[PDB]
Amino acid sequence: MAAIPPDSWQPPNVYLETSMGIIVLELYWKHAPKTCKNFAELARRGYYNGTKFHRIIKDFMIQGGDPTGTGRGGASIYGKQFEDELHPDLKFTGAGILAMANAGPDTNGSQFFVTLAPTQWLDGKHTIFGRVCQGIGMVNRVGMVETNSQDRPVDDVKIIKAYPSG
Incomplete structure (x- = not known):
């Protein structure tokens, strides 16, 4: 009937070609279409290309x-600030996740942090957006490496290019 x-298939996987190492991510095109489009657009337009990780705990x-x-100088495709895309369903405990960073009520930025270790205390503070199925290993070393006495990477980590799977 x-x-x-x-x-329509549409590749739900993203390939971030970082100087540190290549890692695949999983975007939620169901509840995250909003942030997903932003993350994909920013990477497509050529904003992430050239940037690097400054925070490393x-x-x-x-x-x-x-x-x-x-x-x-930072602004989202939709505007300066939007409504948080938080929705009771995901969790920030399983080592290797991609949660969208925020600032305040109806005030979101363009940052992204990947949890490499179990965390229940912060399980709810920030919002989710993606996951790291194939790549957590590359991130693990980034945390095991030598760091500063605050939050400065002693090693060299940066992004050279990024493109979605086809």
């Missing part, structure tokens, strides 16, 4: 830059 000859997580890495 009513058959649609044509079909040993045995915890590592947040990547975007808004000039200093809140100097």
Whole structure:
């Protein structure tokens, strides 16, 4: 009853070609279409290309830059700030996840942090957006490496290019 000859697959995987190492991510095109489009657009337009990770907490997580890495010049495709895409369903405990960073009520930025270690205390503080199925290993080393006495990476980690799977 009513058959649609044509079909649509759409690659739900993203390939971030970082200087540190290549890692695949999983975007939620169901509840995350909003942030998903932003993350994909920013990477497609050529914003993430050239940036790097400034925040790296040993045995915890590592947040990547975007808004000039200093809140100097950063804006979302939809606008400056939007409504948080938080929805009771995901969790930030399983080592290797991609949660969208925020600032305040109805105030979201363009940062992204991947949790490499179990965290229940912060399980709810930030919002989700993607996952790291194939790549957590590359991130693990980034946390095991030598860091500063605050949150500065002693090693060299940056992004050279990024493209979605085809």
